[PDB]
């Protein structure tokens, strides 16, 4: 593997001081280092073997960096095209109209789940008193990190 900054960022999430991060924190550190990965994909390779991932990323930088690169290869799926459109399919009645209740439950109960806390936190003052949410602006504020 290679680049420098990511090694500096690993120590920022050590939380012990040992420079050896855990196989569970693995799935989260990968998310801020540039690009998305799903939970099921992380769970698939090297994640599914507990002793091997503990000896292949619950570790030093040596296995962090190769796992992160493995994710880097599939990330072409960052394409926004399908992901404003998929949203319009839930509440289509004129503009990019949504209802709070529908996105809140659909993104807590279905597929990969999400905690109610995390969903309330995605809805950070983007769904004011009107009940209806505006789709097109959320994909922009979501993709805006």
């Amino acid at each position: 593997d290679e680049i420098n900054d990511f090694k500096e960022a690993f120590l920022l999430f050590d939380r012990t001081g040992d420079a050896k991060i855990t196989l569970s924190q693995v799935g989260d550190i990968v998310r801020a280092l540039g690009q998305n990965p799903t939970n099921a994909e992380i769970n698939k390779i090297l994640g599914n073997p507990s002793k091997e991932e503990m000896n292949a990323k619950k570790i030093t930088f040596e296995e962090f960096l190769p796992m992160l690169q493995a994710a880097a290869n599939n990330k072409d799926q960052g394409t926004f095209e399908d992901f404003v459109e998929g949203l319009r399919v839930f509440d289509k009645e004129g503009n990019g109209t949504v209802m709070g209740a529908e996105l809140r439950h659909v993104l807590a109960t279905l597929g990969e789940k999400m905690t109610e806390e995390e969903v309330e936190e995605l809805m950070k003052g983007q769904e004011d008193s009107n009940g209806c949410i505006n789709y097109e602006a959320f994909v922009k504020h979501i993709m805006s990190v």
Partner: protein
């Protein structure tokens, strides 16, 4: 390190403090100067070993600079109160009501190597009540800059 934080105001507070302990006005505090400052504050029971212990910390006459260097040297990692309050206001970021015990317990132990779990229990005991109620950061700052009783 001791001249690098250390603003003009802090240094003037120290200069006035020196001139109040400096009984004779000469420019050097000695055993005599310490004895009647203690007496003026109500403390009559002072034994020479305590006065001597104070003076022994310095290699020469205690002169303005020797004082400022000796007192700076003990506070090598100490800011003025407003600066300390800024760190808490960043942790507050929403504003006004200060933080909870768990939120900072974790943040002092987590990123970096350690603010040790011996240090942190001493913190909850020496920072309070305050640390239990509102983890009273306002109060925390005033006790570190202005003394323990206050």
């Amino acid at each position: 390190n001791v001249f690098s934080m250390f603003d003009q105001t802090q240094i003037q507070d120290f200069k006035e403090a020196f001139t109040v302990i400096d009984q004779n006005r000469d420019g050097i505090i000695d055993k005599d100067d310490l004895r009647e400052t203690f007496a003026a504050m109500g403390r009559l029971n002072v034994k020479n070993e305590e006065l001597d212990a104070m003076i022994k910390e310095a290699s020469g006459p205690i002169n303005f600079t020797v004082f400022l260097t000796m007192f700076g040297e003990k506070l090598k990692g100490a800011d003025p109160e407003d600066v300390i309050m800024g760190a808490f206001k960043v942790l507050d970021p929403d504003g006004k009501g200060s933080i909870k015990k768990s939120f900072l317990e974790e943040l002092l132990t987590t990123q970096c190597d350690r603010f040790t779990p011996e240090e942190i229990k001493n913190m909850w005991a020496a920072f309070p009540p305050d640390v239990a109620g509102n983890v009273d950061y306002k109060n925390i700052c005033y006790v570190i800059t202005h003394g323990e009783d206050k």
